[PDB]
Amino acid sequence: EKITKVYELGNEPERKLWVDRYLTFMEERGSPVSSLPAVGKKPLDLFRLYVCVKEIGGLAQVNKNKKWRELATNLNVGTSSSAASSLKKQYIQYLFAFECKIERGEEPPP
């Protein structure tokens, strides 16, 4: 489905703003997101994924703590190691540049 779908994957107050802030960043770097990402067949909630990876401490920390399977489970995109590997790939492709830019202070945090 369309990326707009990510607005209804949750009820959080800050979802809409984070999403538009995120989509604006992707457009800015030349990689606009038009379709809602997915892990296999299941829809991927990029907002919740971003927030929880941030809770854990970022990509390197999720790797170190081997939390990809737990996150995939929490996001309902599979419980297998295959689902976990795919989720890590999607995080890298859709969110790591954003994590990196924000951490470096170039992009103010959402």
Residues making contact with Cl ion (CB under 5 A): 24-25, 28, 51
- Determine the Cα–Cα distance for residues 101 and 103; give it in Å rounded to an integer: 6
Minimal distance in Å, beta carbon 108 to Cl ion?
9
Residues 77 and 39: beta-carbon distance below 8 Å: yes
Minimal distance in Å, beta carbon 40 to Zn ion?
21
Of these partners, Cl ion, Zn ion, none, which one is at the site of residue 18 (CB under 5 to 8 Å by kind)? none
CB atoms within 10 A of CB 84: 22
State which residue, 34 or 41, has the beta carbon closest to Zn ion: 34
State which residue, 14 or 20, has the beta carbon closest to Zn ion: 20
20 is an interface residue for Zn ion by CB under 5 A: yes
Residue 1 burial (10 A CB sphere; 0-12, 13-18, 19+): exposed
Tokens of 55: 């809770």
Of these partners, Zn ion, Cl ion, none, which one is at the site of residue 20 (CB under 5 to 8 Å by kind)? Zn ion
